Structures are given as C-alpha cells and as structure tokens.
C-alpha cells in the first residue's frame, strides 16, 4: 500500500529489498552494512537512507544505546532532506523521528518535527492531532488548545480532537464545557479515544456538576480495563497489589515508622507551627484544582524521593527523624509534607495517580469537630499524635468545617508488597 520508492529507487529495488530482508531476519548487524553500502553507492536514495535509519533504530533497541538512537534520529532527518522523497516515506520517516525524540525526552525537538510534518502535510488531520499531543507533553496547554480548536473547525467529528480538547478544558476548570467533548469523544470510538485519562476526567467532571451518570462511565472504564475497580481509578499501577481503602499500621508492616511518628509527633507539630508563624510562604496553595472552595496549602519536605534542602531548613528535626526511614524518603511515587486546611474547605472527590504508594496522615492540630476524610465508603477523623493510613488511589474526599485551622503531616510509603527491585525501577511520579 505505502509507496516508498521514487523513480531511481525502483531501479535498485532488488538491492534495497535484499538489504531490508536481512533486517527483518533480525540479522540487523550485517543489514546496517548492507544499507550503508547502498547509501555510499546511492547517496541520494531515500529508501536506502530510510533503511540505514531503521537499522540504526533496531541497533538502538538491541544495544539500548541513546547515542546510536540519536544517530538514527539524524538519519531519519536525512531522509527528508534528500531530493524526490515519496510522500509516504517522508511522513513515515519524520513521524518515527518525532516518536524517538519523545522517547529520549527531546520534546522540544519533537515539536519542531511535528510542526514540520504539519507544514508538509497541511491536510493530514492525524498529524495536527499528533502536534497537539506534542504540546501537551511539554505542558503547553495553550498552544495545544489552539491546535485542537483548529482541527475541530475543519473536522468537528474527529473524536481524538474532542477528547483532548475536553481534557484541556477540564484542566482549565471548564468543567461543564468539557463534559460533552469528553463524552462525544470517547463515544466516537476513534483510535486513541479509549484512554483511561478521558474516562477518569469525564466522570470527575460529572461528579463536580452533580451529574449522577458519572459512575456509569467509571464502570465502563473498569470494564474496558482502565481502572482496577470503580472505586480505585489510579492510572499508574502495578497490577496485583493488595487493594483496600484503609490500612492498619500492622497491615502495612511499617510499624517502626508509625511508632516514630506517634512518639515524636510534637516536634513535628512544633516545626510546622514555627513555619506557619515565621515562614508561611513555604506553605504553597494546592494547585491541582481539587478544591470546590476554601483554603488548603502544603509545605513539602520530600517529593519524588528527593529531599528539598531549603524546606528541611524550616523543619530540620523532622527531616532528621525521617532520614531513618527509606520506605518513605525513597518513595519516588509519594511525598512528605505538612498539610494545612482551614474552615470553609471542601476537597472534591478525587484519586491519586498510582496504587504503588500508601498514604500516612499524622494528626498535629485537629479541631474537636468539623474535620473528616472519606475514602471509598468509609469516613474517618484525625487524632492529634495518631496516624491514619489509606490508599489514596481509591476515591477520597475531605471537609473542613471547624472554627480554626487543621494541620496534619503526610508521609507516603511504597506499597509494602512492592519488591525492592520494583521500588528501584518504577519511574517517579
């Protein structure tokens, strides 16, 4: 179907197919030399150059070398620079270049490629969509929004554009606006629309507006294998881990950590209060759009398993105490942070990104009433000097209706059933 040979390449189709055949047989090593020989002999051959690129691409996979993949990325570029390159080959080569650039984290580099692809194929809708994803991966939602707006103006029915536009809208707290786009988008069934992210955010948006049809979408997302369960909707999971909303200290196995937190809770409290009084700027407002209303701020000591040196100068004793517990300081999918919440606060029902951590809450300053946290179907209260443990990958919700501030200490730990090698290899979150 895809025509990859220009006029001259057709005249050397035999040599080209011979070399390509060696690549398919896994003998990539002598295939490189085959294509390189063709590249020397026919320096203008797009198919020969593409072959060299693909061989380098496979060599990168075998050797796991970033350096040779970097080379392959250049060779893919070289294909597009040659004269008389067939459109199918030009598109294929640059698409792969972008794909591999994102793999290396050259997202800025990938953008230029995707921009070039859109410039070269102005009527290819899928490429505009890919450009939008490129913007999303670098955190550029503004430019991403424009792209999908441009796509939708020409192709209103493109489901891929609708889910992503909807995703961007919800991220902008355009909750009502986002729902029809997410819904119609998933309902399109177009390739790339059956993604857990869109089920997750469609139901959440529906929950915020009081649309009781939200859980029908959660149920469907579960049926399609996006969610472990309707209640537990984290998207970055290790399948099989013990799943329950609430944990006891013994169940976690982290009894020594819990002992230390509860024995020394007052020193943790006092440093938190000292920061509130003398350095409240270290407390940063919650910035994930999780609040319906009210005030909620956090003062983070550890994140992604990395100690914040400057923050710990505000809570030196607490940081020193925690150094002894790598099960939390080494949790690269969790944090260690103070969390202050004031009256008139309601946190929307929400879900953490991963099932790979458990979340400890140590009460520091807890008003006698007004403060509570629901996880799944059970609501509980905090106690000063006492630890609560829950899996925040389950839907949970929070209220603050006291008459003074509520301060807790949050300590994330690896899910205890995670092996040491999993704890070592899992990418940070």
């Amino acid at each position: 179907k895809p025509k990859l040979l220009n006029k001259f390449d057709k005249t050397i189709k035999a040599e080209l197919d011979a070399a390509e055949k060696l690549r398919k047989r896994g003998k990539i090593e002598e295939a490189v030399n085959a294509f390189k020989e063709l590249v020397r002999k026919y320096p203008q051959s797009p198919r020969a150059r593409y072959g060299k690129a693909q061989c380098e691409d496979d060599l990168a996979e075998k050797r796991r070398s970033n350096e040779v993949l970097r080379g392959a990325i250049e060779t893919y570029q070289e294909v597009a620079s040659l004269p008389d390159v067939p459109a199918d080959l030009l598109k294929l080569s640059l698409k792969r270049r972008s794909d591999r650039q994102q793999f290396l984290g050259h997202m800025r580099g990938s953008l230029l490629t995707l921009q070039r692809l859109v410039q070269l194929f102005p009527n290819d809708t899928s490429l505009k969509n890919d450009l939008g994803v490129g913007y999303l991966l670098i955190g550029d939602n503004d430019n991403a929004k424009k792209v999908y707006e441009e796509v939708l103006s020409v192709t209103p029915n493109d489901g891929f554009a609708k889910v992503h536009y909807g995703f961007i809208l919800k991220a902008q707290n355009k909750i009502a606006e986002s729902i029809p786009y997410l819904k119609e988008g998933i309902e399109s069934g177009d390739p790339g629309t059956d993604d857990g992210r869109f089920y997750f955010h469609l139901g959440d948006a529906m929950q915020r507006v009081g649309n009781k049809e939200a859980y029908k979408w959660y149920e469907l997302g579960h049926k399609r294998g996006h969610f472990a369960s309707v209640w537990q909707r984290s998207l970055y999971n290790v399948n099989g881990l013990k799943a329950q909303p609430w944990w006891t200290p013994k169940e976690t196995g982290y009894t020594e950590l819990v002992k230390s937190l509860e024995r020394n809770w007052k020193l943790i409290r006092d440093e938190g209060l000292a920061v509130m009084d003398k350095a409240k700027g270290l407390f940063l407002p919650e910035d994930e759009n999780l609040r319906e209303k009210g005030d909620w701020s956090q003062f983070t000591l550890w994140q992604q398993g990395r100690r914040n040196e400057n923050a710990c100068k505000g809570a030196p004793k607490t940081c020193t105490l925690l150094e002894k517990f790598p099960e939390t300081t080494g949790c690269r999918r969790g944090q260690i942070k103070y969390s202050i919440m004031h009256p008139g606060t309601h946190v929307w029902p929400h879900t953490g990104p991963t099932n790979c951590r458990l979340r400890m809450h140590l009460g520091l300053v807890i008003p006698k009433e007004g403060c509570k946290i629901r996880c799944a179907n059970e609501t509980k209260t905090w106690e000063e000097g006492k630890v609560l443990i829950f899996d925040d990958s389950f839907e949970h919700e929070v209220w603050q209706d006291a008459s003074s501030f509520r301060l807790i200490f949050i300590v994330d730990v690896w899910h205890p059933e995670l092996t040491p090698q999993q704890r070592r290899s899992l990418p940070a979150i």
Partner: peptide, 18 residues
Amino acid sequence: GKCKDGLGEYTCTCLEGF
C-alpha cells in the same frame, strides 16, 4: 507540572532514554 495528589496532567511520568 507534577501529579502529586491527582491526575491533572496529561502525563505524570517523565522518562529520558533507555
């Protein structure tokens, strides 16, 4: 842009190379 308490970001992980 990080996913700390929620799933607000398009991707929560950021990997580079093999």
